[PDB]
């Protein structure tokens, strides 16, 4: 190609969006934004294929141009705006606030939250560095740069960002015993507690995570997101609480509730 | 596939030229203007010589036998 691509085939789209393979030939290409293309949910999919509020792309555009959707407290009018992990989506006219959190299956789940919970979000500290004029700043996972961070904040820590003012309220250090959320790999969407962090200089660090059921799994550090201390998450969790459950029991409880 | 016969070698003379050069370098072991300008005999000789050397039909079976029998 002689330049950046602008089209996305449905088969090539991220699997977790759950798009019909025969509905059309192309899928919404997320525009540039806070989150990466493969780890983002465009607003069109959320409003049409998840909430079912709109029946087609044009109706989604009509909703957006009416300025009823807010992302992180800001109005967005792009159909393919890349909303992502820990993103707050507010619909005032319908009066709901949603937090984009993966389910156990590995898919963004429609999780409704209260207003007081919608007032803040969490961000994994991807980078800390001194800017121009000797002003420290922190870059989070969603591309937010916050100046004058607390000196104790380091990489791999989590910062509680208030949406209205965009300032850090609290933070969590990355240490053993902390509650973590998996954001990648086939363990995507699971929740557990840190046990040990294995370090390899010049390589990818590995973290051992133990679930509430005592099952243990190892994951690369890049896919780990600290969300609080054990038993005290700073955000409301989706149904299932990030516990992976086998297939036989899946049959079992589906029958039981049925 | 590099030197395979083409349907119309005359339509792609320049291409064939490259092949010859490549051969001359690949088999050397065995042997041993600015168009973007505001204003734009030997060149005609170059055309003639290059096109002639590029295209010379390989002598045929019957020509082989005729030469041997003449000798």
């Amino acid at each position: 190609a002689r330049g950046p691509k602008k089209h996305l085939k449905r088969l090539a789209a991220p699997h977790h969006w759950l798009l019909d393979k025969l509905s059309g030939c192309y899928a919404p290409r997320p525009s540039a934004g806070p989150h990466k293309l493969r780890e983002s949910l465009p607003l069109i999919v959320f409003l049409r294929n998840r909430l079912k509020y709109a029946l087609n792309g044009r109706e989604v555009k009509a909703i957006l141009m009416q300025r009823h959707v807010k992302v992180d407290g800001k109005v967005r009018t792009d159909t393919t705006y890349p909303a992502g992990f820990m993103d707050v989506i507010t619909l005032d006219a319908t009066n709901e606030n949603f937090r984009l959190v993966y389910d156990v299956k590995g898919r963004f789940a429609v999780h409704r939250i209260t207003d007081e919970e919608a007032s803040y979000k969490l961000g994994k500290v991807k980078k800390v560095q001194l800017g121009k004029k000797g002003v420290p700043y922190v870059v989070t996972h969603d591309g937010r740069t916050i100046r004058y961070p607390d000196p104790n904040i380091k990489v791999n820590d989590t910062v509680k960002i208030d949406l209205a003012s965009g300032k850090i309220t609290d933070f969590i250090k990355f240490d053993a015993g902390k509650l973590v959320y998996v954001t990648g790999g086939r363990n995507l969407g699971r929740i557990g507690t840190i046990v040990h962090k294995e370090r390899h200089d010049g390589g990818f660090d590995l973290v051992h995570i133990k679930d509430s059921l005592d099952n243990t799994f190892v994951t690369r550090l890049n896919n780990v997101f600290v969300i609080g201390e054990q038993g005290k998450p700073y955000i409301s969790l989706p149904k299932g609480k990030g516990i992976k459950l086998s297939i036989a029991e899946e049959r079992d409880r589906r029958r039981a509730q049925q | 596939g590099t030197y395979r016969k083409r349907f119309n070698e005359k339509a792609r003379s320049g291409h064939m030229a490259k092949l010859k050069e490549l051969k001359r370098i690949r088999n050397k072991q065995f042997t041993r203007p600015n168009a973007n300008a505001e204003i734009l005999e030997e060149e005609k000789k170059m055309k003639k010589r290059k096109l002639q050397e590029l295209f010379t039909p390989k002598e045929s079976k019957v020509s082989r036998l005729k030469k041997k029998r003449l000798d």
Partner: protein
């Protein structure tokens, strides 16, 4: 272009179609079940072979294997639901003991015959293809329709059918009109 839509063949030609004993076997199956052609028999045989090969592969696995337990249980549930496999025989070994006749009986044609709605298997076929038979509240016109245990008790003449309480068909009212005239 649009993504492909998958397709598959539902029948396979036999290893030796020319065995005399075989030919007699399809003669039996077609004659007793009123099958139009041999392709129906081959289709049922192919489905049965797939089922029993899966059962054999599951048996090869060690007992208590999670894959074995899950998939064998699913297969037994499906076979019980369609009715080929009786309730008291819920083990993978008896699945290997199934036969083509078991599936053939569950066909809507044969069930219609047994229930007494038709006097011949061919009468059942013509009744089904003519939109006179309804399972539950819905009309089925396909002789190859497979009946479930729950569906078995709901087979009846369709509401729209003249035999099911609707008005007489075209021939009857035509004859009545000419007689009146």
């Amino acid at each position: 272009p649009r993504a492909p839509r998958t397709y598959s063949k539902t029948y396979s030609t036999p290893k030796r179609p020319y065995e005399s004993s075989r030919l007699d076997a399809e003669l039996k199956l077609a004659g007793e079940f009123g099958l139009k052609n041999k392709k129906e028999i081959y289709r049922i045989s192919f489905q049965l072979s797939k089922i029993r090969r899966a059962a054999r592969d599951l048996l090869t696995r060690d007992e208590k294997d999670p894959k074995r337990l899950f998939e064998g249980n699913a297969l037994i549930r499906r076979l019980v639901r369609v009715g080929v496999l009786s309730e008291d025989k819920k083990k993978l070994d008896y699945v290997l003991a199934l036969k083509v006749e078991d599936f053939l009986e569950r066909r809507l044609q044969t069930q219609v015959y047994k229930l007494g709605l038709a006097k011949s298997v061919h009468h059942a076929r013509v009744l089904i293809t003519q939109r006179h038979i309804a399972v539950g509240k819905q009309i089925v016109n396909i002789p190859s329709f497979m009946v479930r245990l729950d569906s078995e008790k709901h087979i009846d003449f369709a509401p729209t059918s003249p035999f099911g309480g609707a008005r007489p068909g075209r021939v009857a009212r035509r004859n009545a009109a000419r007689k009146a005239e």
